[PDB]
Amino acid sequence: TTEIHPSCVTRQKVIGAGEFGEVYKGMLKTSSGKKEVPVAIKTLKAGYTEKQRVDFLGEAGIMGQFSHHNIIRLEGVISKYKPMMIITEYMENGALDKFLREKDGEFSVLQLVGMLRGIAAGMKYLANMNYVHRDLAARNILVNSNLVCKVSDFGLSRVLEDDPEATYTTSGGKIPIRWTAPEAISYRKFTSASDVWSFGIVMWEVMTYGERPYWELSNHEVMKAINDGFRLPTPMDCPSAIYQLMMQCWQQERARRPKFADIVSILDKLIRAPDSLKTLADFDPRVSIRLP
Numbered sequence: 001t002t003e004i005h006p007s008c009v010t011r012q013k014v015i016g017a018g019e020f021g022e023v024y025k026g027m028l029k030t031s032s033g034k035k036e037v038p039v040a041i042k043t044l045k046a047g048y049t050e051k052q053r054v055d056f057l058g059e060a061g062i063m064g065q066f067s068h069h070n071i072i073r074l075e076g077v078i079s080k081y082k083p084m085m086i087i088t089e090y091m092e093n094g095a096l097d098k099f100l101r102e103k104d105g106e107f108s109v110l111q112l113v114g115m116l117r118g119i120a121a122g123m124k125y126l127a128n129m130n131y132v133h134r135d136l137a138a139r140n141i142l143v144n145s146n147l148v149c150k151v152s153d154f155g156l157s158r159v160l161e162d163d164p165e166a167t168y169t170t171s172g173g174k175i176p177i178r179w180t181a182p183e184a185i186s187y188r189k190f191t192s193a194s195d196v197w198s199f200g201i202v203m204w205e206v207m208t209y210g211e212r213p214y215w216e217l218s219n220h221e222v223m224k225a226i227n228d229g230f231r232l233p234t235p236m237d238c239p240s241a242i243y244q245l246m247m248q249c250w251q252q253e254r255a256r257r258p259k260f261a262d263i264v265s266i267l268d269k270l271i272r273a274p275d276s277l278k279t280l281a282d283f284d285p286r287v288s289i290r291l292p
């Protein structure tokens with residue numbers, strides 16, 4: 001984990017404000033002053049607690065363990081000087097859910113499926129590294145200028161044995177239940193198979209351009225529907241094979257869900273033979289329009 005000297009970091013614009021600190025777009029001078037790259041910079045403001053420090057630096061320490069095209073890349077940290085900083089590659093199009101909501105209907109099916117393949121490859125890498133994400137959702141995916149999607153949001157509570165915060169978000173809040181598999185909701189059994197359930201929800205988010213899973217249903221109403229066997233209906237214009245794959249991610253019995261390797265393989269097969277994506281699942285209309 002590379003310690004960066006503050007003289008190598010310039011902050012150009014705020015892109016996110018927080019209670020704990022801010023996130024900036026900036027530049028990082030690297031390679032002994034011979035290179036310069038755009039970066040995102042997150043700070044931890046003075047007065048942070050020991051827990052806030054361990055969580056903050058812990059996320060960087062985990063990110064530094066990974067080297068994959070579909071996982072956000074860590075440049076390094078500033079810990080010896082204040083404010084402390086985590087510095088990553090800069091993802092020009094921000095969070096995937098917001099990106100899709102601002103680009104509604106503008107991508108092809110093949111582009112959407114390609115985004116899902118990248119996310120699945122990142123998740124396959126994480127799962128094979130024995131990292132369970134626990135909060136996989138489009139809001140935790142970032143998108144670059146070239147439409148590459150990368151998994152982000154990481155924390156020590158996911159790796160430490162019997163962490164008292166293992167069932168919370170990386171901020172200490174409640175993991176939004178509508179992305180979470182039933183056995184993780186009810187028994188706190190988080191595994192890569194519960195991440196697969198979450199990935200299925202991400203597939204639905206992508207194919208709907210960022211719709212809210214289960215629409216207006218409350219959390220208890222979502223739990224009621226899932227445990228009754230209800231599942232999200234097919235998005236509009238969604239390939240049958242893609243909807244079948246998300247349905248398999250949502251099998252109640254976790255051993256019946258695909259592994260991330262299966263997901264990557266299936267998505268690859270569909271992209272390579274794109275006529276396979278022309279068979280569309282029937283979209284259930286929610287409004288009767290009677291016309292001649």
Ligand SMILES: Cc1cccc(Cl)c1NC(=O)c1cnc(Nc2cc(Br)cc(C(=O)NC3CCNCC3)c2)s1
Pocket residue numbers: 015016023040041042059072086087088089090091092093094095142152153
């Ligand atoms: C710095 C850091 C520390 C710890 C964990 C992580 Cl994942 C990070 N890195 C980051 O948060 C980020 C990396 N890239 C980011 N890109 C980003 C985020 C946000 Br908010 C907004 C924008 C951004 O300004 N996006 C444009 C402007 C608005 N519409 C189109 C997208 C970019 S945030």
